[PDB]
Amino acid sequence: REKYLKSVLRELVTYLLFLIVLCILTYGMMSSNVYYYTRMMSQLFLDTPVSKTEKTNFKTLSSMEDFWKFTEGSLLDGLYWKNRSFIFYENLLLGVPRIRQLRVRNGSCSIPQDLRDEIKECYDVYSVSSEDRAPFGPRNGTAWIYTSEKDLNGSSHWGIIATYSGAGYYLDLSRTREETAAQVASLKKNVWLDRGTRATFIDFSVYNANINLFCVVRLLVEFPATGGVIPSWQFQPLKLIRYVTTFDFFLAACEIIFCFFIFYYVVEEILRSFWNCLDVVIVVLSVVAIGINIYRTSNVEVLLQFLEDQNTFPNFEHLAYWQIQFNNIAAVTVFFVWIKLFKFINFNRTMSQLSTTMSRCAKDLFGFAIMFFIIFLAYAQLAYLVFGTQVDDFSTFQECIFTQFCIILGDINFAEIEEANRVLGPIYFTTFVFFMFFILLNMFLAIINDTYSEVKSDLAQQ
Amino acid sequence: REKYLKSVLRELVTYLLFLIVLCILTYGMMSSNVYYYTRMMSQLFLDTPVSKTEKTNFKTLSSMEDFWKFTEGSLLDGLYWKNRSFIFYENLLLGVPRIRQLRVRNGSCSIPQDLRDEIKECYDVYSVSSEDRAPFGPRNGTAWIYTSEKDLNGSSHWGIIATYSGAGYYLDLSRTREETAAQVASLKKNVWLDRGTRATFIDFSVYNANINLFCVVRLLVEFPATGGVIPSWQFQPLKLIRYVTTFDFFLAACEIIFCFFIFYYVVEEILRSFWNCLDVVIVVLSVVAIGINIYRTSNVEVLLQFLEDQNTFPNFEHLAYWQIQFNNIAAVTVFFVWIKLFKFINFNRTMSQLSTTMSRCAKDLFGFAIMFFIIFLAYAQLAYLVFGTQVDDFSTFQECIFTQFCIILGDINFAEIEEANRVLGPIYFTTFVFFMFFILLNMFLAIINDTYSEVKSDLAQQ
Amino acid sequence: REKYLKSVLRELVTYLLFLIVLCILTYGMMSSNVYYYTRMMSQLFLDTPVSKTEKTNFKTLSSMEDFWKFTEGSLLDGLYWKNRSFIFYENLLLGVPRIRQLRVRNGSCSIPQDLRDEIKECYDVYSVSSEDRAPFGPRNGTAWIYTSEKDLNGSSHWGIIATYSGAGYYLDLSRTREETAAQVASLKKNVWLDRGTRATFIDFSVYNANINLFCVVRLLVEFPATGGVIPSWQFQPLKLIRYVTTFDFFLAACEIIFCFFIFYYVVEEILRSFWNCLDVVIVVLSVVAIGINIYRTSNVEVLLQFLEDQNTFPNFEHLAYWQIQFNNIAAVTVFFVWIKLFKFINFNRTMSQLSTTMSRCAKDLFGFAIMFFIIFLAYAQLAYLVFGTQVDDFSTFQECIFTQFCIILGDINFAEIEEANRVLGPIYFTTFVFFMFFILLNMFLAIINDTYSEVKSDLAQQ
Amino acid sequence: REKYLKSVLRELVTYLLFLIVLCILTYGMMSSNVYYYTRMMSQLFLDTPVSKTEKTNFKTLSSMEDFWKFTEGSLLDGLYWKNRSFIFYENLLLGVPRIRQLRVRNGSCSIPQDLRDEIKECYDVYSVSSEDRAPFGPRNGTAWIYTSEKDLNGSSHWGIIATYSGAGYYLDLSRTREETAAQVASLKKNVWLDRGTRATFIDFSVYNANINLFCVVRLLVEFPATGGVIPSWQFQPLKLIRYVTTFDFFLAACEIIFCFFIFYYVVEEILRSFWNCLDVVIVVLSVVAIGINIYRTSNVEVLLQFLEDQNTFPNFEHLAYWQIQFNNIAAVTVFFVWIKLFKFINFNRTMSQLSTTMSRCAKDLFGFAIMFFIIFLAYAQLAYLVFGTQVDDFSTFQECIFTQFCIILGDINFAEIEEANRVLGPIYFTTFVFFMFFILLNMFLAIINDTYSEVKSDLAQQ
Structure with a gap:
């Protein structure tokens, strides 16, 4: 027994140090302030009413007229604070927003002959x-002429109804x-949004x-082929300027130390079984x-280029x-x-009995x-x-899938199930609840209960 | 053993092909776009305020005055977009709406003698x-004179308080x-709605x-014998024009292939036990x-008649x-x-032990x-x-019944249970929650736990 | 065995008849219309805004000024429909509402000497x-002079902060x-409401x-000793005029048949054990x-007195x-x-095993x-x-008590638990969820699981 | 056996008296009236809209302009009822409110060199x-000059983003x-709130x-370094004037009697065992x-000083x-x-079997x-x-932590889990629900199930 414990103890001390280094590094990523930052x-862009005479949020666009009311109203009063703008007196606006649109060809579908x-x-x-990709309207520059994903330094984006290319028609906002x-x-007077x-x-x-963070904003408004509108948003905080404080320099030491542990574990694996699978993972x-x-260090040159x-x-x-x-x-x-x-964790005959239960059960x-x-x-496909x-x-x-997990737990919206289909709705709900x-x-x-009493009946005797 | 596994494997390959054909056919029915269509x-007809000066949705009618405010207001501005109308610039209105009412005779009940x-x-x-069934008001036309379910090409409908005939008094809207x-x-000035x-x-x-879909709208407003109003709605998508894309013409081949599988299984059943019950089902x-x-192909001539x-x-x-x-x-x-x-699914001594548990337990x-x-x-009748x-x-x-399933899962509305009856409400809730x-x-x-360890204790020894 | 089954079958047939007669009698009490009646x-009295310029419901009074705005506004427009009034065009107002108040003496408490x-x-x-009980204000009749519970034909009422006598100061509304x-x-100008x-x-x-029902309305507005207001309501349906339809005359036969069964069971019990306890109950x-x-048949003369x-x-x-x-x-x-x-229910060796489990477990x-x-x-007292x-x-x-049942099921309001006490709130919630x-x-x-496998281990051998 | 039971009975009788005295004391401090007091x-200060025009509560400040609109509006109309003020006609305002602010130095952080x-x-x-700690603006007294926590008779407060000193800049309100x-x-015209x-x-x-209670109010509004605002509140009832009624004089006897039990149990435990651990607790x-x-009897001189x-x-x-x-x-x-x-509670072979289960299981x-x-x-750190x-x-x-307990119970907010991260949100939620x-x-x-059948299999035989 002792010669196994003597190697395990050195692994445990090494592992507690590795764990602590990563925990310090990752607590170092955030402060409770950052939730209030986003x-x-x-709340300034989404939850302010679209116009002082209107009930709609940006969360509640339904038409191109709501979108123009937003982009002429609640957007501009959110961005430009009375040259410079700070979107609250603490938070500087970095120069110039951009509007981009994506568009589909007239006649790109088969109308039935009737x-x-x-x-x-x-x-x-x-x-x-x-x-x-054709130029339209008055053709006065990038708002009315197409440019590719590569010309625009852009990337493809995952929306709700579709993924979207990084390309399009675009304008930089002053x-x-x-x-x-x-x-x-x-753009509105020239009818820049249409069919x-x-x-x-x-x-x-x-x-x-x-608190030395950049927040990057995307608003995406989709315009489905069914008519109507679907708004969506992103507000992402970034720590691009790596180190300035004594705490950042301490994290920078931990960041180097983490690579020594990763190198040590790479060598130990160079020198089939779940713990070995988890080591590789x-x-x-x-x-x-x-x-x-490491790649992010050269991506940060975009800040140097912007400045x-x-x-x-x-x-x-x-x-x-x-x-x-x-992240x-x-x-x-x-x-x-x-x-x-x-x-x-296998300290004693209780902890080894609990861990032996999970591994013997998982089959x-x-x-x-x-x-x-x-x-x-x-049931999901039904x-x-x-x-x-x-x-x-x-x-x-x-x-x-996600709603059926919510229903098994107890987050239920049964009124809308029945109003959608009064015959199958209650039958589906009743049988799903009963059978699941x-x-x-x-x-x-x-399975768990019988495995536990099996394992305990062995460890009472082994 | 081998010959049985090989004949079962040929049935399994046949079954996986049948499964895939039906899964392709039924994925062919829909796209995520269709939810946004409905x-x-x-949201245009239901959730728009009944009038610019009012708070009520069509979801929140409560009087004949709300219904006239709706049918003179929010309805018309939803239907007619500035001859033709597109209910959003993508969706054509098919000609002409219809209003129909159902009505009860004066003195059709026993007033107490006192x-x-x-x-x-x-x-x-x-x-x-x-x-x-008698004509009323000015008697100028079909709004003021009864017509039967058969005269009107209609069918009987299930409302909230009652089922309703397809008959009645009706007007076609221009x-x-x-x-x-x-x-x-x-209609409003002639008092077309009354006691x-x-x-x-x-x-x-x-x-x-x-996306080549029709959508059919019913609004049903009931007028209970208690006084007041109850609104309800249906918005149903329809793919009447069967095939136009290469994917539809592929689905048409799958639709023929599915008939060959059903014919094969009908012959095998012509050539008592749960799998045989499920096979017949x-x-x-x-x-x-x-x-x-097939009957839907005869019904689709109604589109050709309309055009x-x-x-x-x-x-x-x-x-x-x-x-x-x-559907x-x-x-x-x-x-x-x-x-x-x-x-x-009985691949191995784990899967057969799980399936044997359910069949041996179900008794x-x-x-x-x-x-x-x-x-x-x-408890439901209490x-x-x-x-x-x-x-x-x-x-x-x-x-x-459905609310008692919601309560067992933790979707609860206890404040309204107690406000309805402060003595029995808490007693009902407390005892239901405790005993259920x-x-x-x-x-x-x-029952399940004891069956599983019984079955596992047998399959450890057989 | 057979001689026991032959008596049990006659009891079972007798019991199914008794069950059906009672179930018919209680289905005779209601139709789905009655929910829509209340x-x-x-919604007319409670959910209509107190005034056209105000946001408050009767559900949301907070002051005597809200109560006067309600009783001068939303109340009167709910009652009096343009002599007679029908509270909807279907439902007659029976003559005259009544206002009553209950009141406390000046100096009925010990102010501290400091x-x-x-x-x-x-x-x-x-x-x-x-x-x-003293007369106050201008003393012009029953609004300003006390009358007892017995003088007023009243009864004591259960409010939210207190039970209340049926006595008070009162006015009959025209x-x-x-x-x-x-x-x-x-009443308002004479300051009829005060501290x-x-x-x-x-x-x-x-x-x-x-549908031949009366509805009786109480609105109770309490005025706590802390200052402020607490509104509450009752709307109760009644079938005072019992028999008018062929279905009522059928129920009148079932009502007499139920008395014959109760007489039969009183004699059988006159001619210690749970079924005997349940039979007596x-x-x-x-x-x-x-x-x-029977007492209610004598009380129904109050309708004849009113008419x-x-x-x-x-x-x-x-x-x-x-x-x-x-009810x-x-x-x-x-x-x-x-x-x-x-x-x-003990038909077979499965049902007797399930029923034997509950009786042997309940100890x-x-x-x-x-x-x-x-x-x-x-935990409730904590x-x-x-x-x-x-x-x-x-x-x-x-x-x-009732909230702790809701929390065990999953209806939780954790934000208000934490805002009330940021130290103990989370500790209480976490430990309650963990230990309960x-x-x-x-x-x-x-207890249930071990009892079931015990009972089944006996019934496999007995 | 009997000689153990005869001493245990004297402990039980003594303990029931101790229990009853404490339960009388803690019921004696409180009534359902007090919830309606707070x-x-x-509702007067928090839920009244900030102005006659705005939609915001004090619960919904978001700027210094909202805070000035509140403190010029909804606050003052809540405090000063038309010399004295009663915050409802029943509740006297004690003298004079106070406003205090806490403030941070210009340049107290490292701006990056770029x-x-x-x-x-x-x-x-x-x-x-x-x-x-520097004096600012016009310097006309305590609103514009710092004072320490000790000078101000204050204490340190736990806010949301930070703990706060009791010190600062302050004004007493008339x-x-x-x-x-x-x-x-x-204060508003002199720009008393800034960066x-x-x-x-x-x-x-x-x-x-x-009902003889004081209620003490704190409103705390935080102004985070991210820009924006965070409102919070406290309303605490106090029974500072200890005894005035015959029920208080009865509680004063119970309050003395409680000390004789505590003295008895201090002596008995002075004259490893869980019950002795619980006795010490x-x-x-x-x-x-x-x-x-006893310390609170000395602190109550603050009321005598105020008067x-x-x-x-x-x-x-x-x-x-x-x-x-x-409390x-x-x-x-x-x-x-x-x-x-x-x-x-160990009365019988059922109760001792249930209590033996919990103690033998807890390991x-x-x-x-x-x-x-x-x-x-x-999962919490993820x-x-x-x-x-x-x-x-x-x-x-x-x-x-608290949200993950809510999700295990079925109080779920899954829409905001997905909108924050459409890839990891569903993966986190699904795997958390499945694995937890x-x-x-x-x-x-x-663990519990096998322990209970173990303990019962012993107590069937011992």
């Missing part, structure tokens, strides 16, 4: 083949309110001097995170995307670095999870075919 | 015997707003050229679906109804086609399901007699 | 000893709006000729219900109360009549229910002392 | 080192509305003569509560703080006094609670790093 930003005398034209769903109002009013539009984007970014995700972290002329649009689109992907993988590595503690939990999810996904054209909570097959929650979910309890 | 429609000097008349709940306003104002009205219906339909439901699918003169009401009532019944049965066939996968789960539902329905005259969530014996959720629901759990 | 009533130079008077909480406005404005008030009541009643509650039914002069308040207060008590007891008899079906479930409820009520001065959901020891829901609630399940 | 107070030509200054997060409006307007503000406090107190907390109660000249701010801040801490420890001692009943429940909370806290900058329900690591609720939580079930 909350105060989003209707062609009555309906002259149609415009498809947005796609790279239906996308429109330093001040009176200039920008004349620009947006010129062919399928999205618009409004982008800008802001710097907080007091932790190491690979850490190497990916370090690769993104030569603050009449340019600050293209922090890629920086925000890779900060999000870094995503940092959060996931922290999670797996906690799960590995279960290698060491049957996996078998029953497939068996459960066939029935759950059959729900999608019955309610998916009526109920927001079921509008996509993805939402059918009163019957099938209790199989997990049976 | 959402953008319903009150006949004070109350001169009464008007019953709507029924086929209380229904009024091509444009100024014509329709003069028609509706003429005897028990429902009105407003019907119309629309076509989306961009899948076959019969698929034969009914194919029958409705000769677009100054006429498009009677897609039956097409919408049979599309709903087709209803199709969704249910998909569900049972997924459940049949369990005929083949005792059915016994306890009766025993549970006696107590549950006793709740209906105590709260049914006070609380919306218990306003019918059907609502009581803390006690009786755990019997299912005990 | 809903349409309550404060008597600064505070000249105090007025206690309402009680029968603090209650005020047949028409212009008369009633002059009466209420005279001494502790409640007002506004009472009236209504008749629906179309059903018989006693049925005899109490028949007694209340001589409809310029008088219809005192249906007792009829509404005894109908509520009849309360009838619903409970129906519940126990369903539970007695378990005396016969230990009762022991653990006490043991659980000591901890639950300790919550009452910490949150009960801050959070509505804990504002009484009864609310604490993750730990103690699983003891009921463990 | 509710009627808070930006110093563009951004002239920054102001840090509030801390005792960044705090500003007896009447016209005076107080001129004071607040003078450097990090909190303001508005404090006052009130007396209810009718009950005794120490009771001695601490008695110490706080000499009411043109002064009543500093009931410490009295309110210690009354809250007394906290009183509620907790009541809770542990209920738990000690489990010493005596493994502690082991698994550590094992569960590693995974739960890993959620904090992903959603914490976007979602209010995750805006701190403490909020993440369908899997890991059910280990607690397995």
